[PDB]
Design a protein around this ligand. Structure first.
Ligand SMILES: Nc1ncnc2c1ncn2[C@@H]1O[C@@H]2CO[P@@](=O)(S)O[C@@H]3[C@H](O)[C@@H](CO[P@@](=O)(S)O[C@H]2[C@H]1F)O[C@H]3n1cnc2c(=O)[nH]ncc21
Lengths: 181, 181
C-alpha cells in the first residue's frame, strides 16, 4: 500500500503546508509585536510538526505530556478554497516546561494525516491492517521530508519531529529540536 | 495507483465528513431560525459536494458558473484536533439562479481532495501522470460513495454530485439534485 501514505503526504503539502508556511513568519511576527505579553519570551520561528510513528494523535497535547501547556492562538489565516469563502487555517502556540519553568514557546501540532492512517486501520471497509500502519507512518514522513527538502515554501519555517515510544518525555524531544536552532 | 484515491477518500471521510455531518442539521436549523432573512427561502438540508471528474476545482464558484452567487456563511463549527485548539470547520451557502431568479439555496462546495489530485499530476516529484488522474478522480468518488452508503453519520445530510464537461450549466446540475428531494 505504498500509494496511501505517498498520496496523503502530497495532500498535506499541497492543501496545507504550501498555503500556510509562506505567511507563517508574518503571523508569528504579528503575534510577537502586538498580542504576545511584553515580558514573556518570544514565540520561536518555524511550525513544529509532531510525527508519532505509532500514529497516536490525541486532540489535546496536555494529555500526551503534562509539560506542554496551551499558551494562545496565532492570528487566524483565511482564504477562499474549493468553494468555501474564507476557510480558516488556525495554529496554536504551546509552552514547553522544564523543571516547572517555561523553557521555550513554539507553534506546535501533530500531522493530522497520521490520525487518519490510525483510523483507516480500525475500519474493515478500508482494508488496511495495523502491521501496514507502521510502514505507512514512516513512508508518510519520508515523502514529506523529500517534498520539503526541495520545496520553495520550506525556507527555515518548518521542523519535522518523528519519534517512537517504547520513559519518553515528549517535551524534551521538542526542546531538543528547538534548542538546535 | 489505486491506493492514492482510496487513501484520500478515507481521509475526506475520517478527518472531515464524519466530524461535520452529525452537527450539520443543527447548523442549518440555527441559520434558518436566527441568521437567515425571514422573507427569503429556507436553506435546504444536506451538504452538496461537487465532484468534477476533470479535477477542475476553482477557489470561487461564481467563476465556474455565473448563476451560483455566494449568499452567506453557516455558523462556524470548532473543535480541538491534532493539537490545534478550536480548529474551524466553515461552510458556505450559495444561491442557484434560474432565469435570473433565486431557484434554490444550499450548502455547496467542491471535494478538496480532487484539487490535490490535480496538483499532484503537475509536480514531477509526485510521479503521477494526467492520464492516471481521470481514473483516480472516479476511484475517489466510488470509494466515498461506498463509505457514505454504509456510514452512520450519512443520514439524509449529504449529496454527491459527479460530472464531466465535454454547454454544461453547473447551476442546472445542482438544481436537478436539489429538486429530487
Ligand atoms: N485548517 C487546517 N488545520 C489543520 N490542518 C489542516 C488544515 N487544512 C488542512 N490541514 C491538513 O492538511 C490535510 C489536507 O487538507 P484538505 O483540506 S486538502 O483536505 C482534507 C483531507 O482530504 C481530509 C482529512 O483531514 P485532515 O485534517 S486528516 O487532513 C488535512 C490536515 F492534515 O479532510 C479534508 N478536510 C479537512 N478539513 C477540511 C475542511 O475544513 N474543509 N474541506 C475539507 C477538509
Amino acid at each position: 500500500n505504498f500509494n496511501v501514505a505517498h498520496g496523503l503526504a502530497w495532500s498535506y503539502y499541497i492543501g496545507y503546508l504550501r498555503l500556510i508556511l509562506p505567511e507563517l513568519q508574518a503571523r508569528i511576527r504579528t503575534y510577537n509585536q502586538h498580542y504576545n505579553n511584553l515580558l514573556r519570551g518570544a514565540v520561536s520561528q518555524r511550525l513544529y510538526i509532531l510525527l508519532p510513528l505509532d500514529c497516536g494523535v490525541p486532540d489535546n497535547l496536555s494529555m500526551a505530556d503534562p509539560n506542554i501547556r496551551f499558551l494562545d492562538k496565532l492570528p487566524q489565516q483565511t482564504g477562499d478554497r474549493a468553494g468555501i469563502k474564507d476557510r480558516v487555517y488556525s495554529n496554536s502556540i504551546y509552552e514547553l516546561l522544564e523543571n516547572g519553568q517555561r523553557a521555550g514557546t513554539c507553534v506546535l501540532e501533530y500531522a493530522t494525516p497520521l490520525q487518519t492512517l490510525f483510523a483507516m486501520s480500525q475500519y474493515s471497509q478500508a482494508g488496511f491492517s495495523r502491521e501496514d500502519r507502521l510502514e505507512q507512518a514512516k513512508l508518510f514522513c519520508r515523502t514529506l521530508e523529500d517534498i520539503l527538502a526541495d520545496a520553495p515554501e520550506s525556507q527555515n519555517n518548518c521542523r519535522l519531529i518523528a519519534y517512537q515510544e517504547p520513559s519518553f518525555s515528549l517535551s524534551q524531544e521538542v526542546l531538543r529540536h528547538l534548542r538546535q536552532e
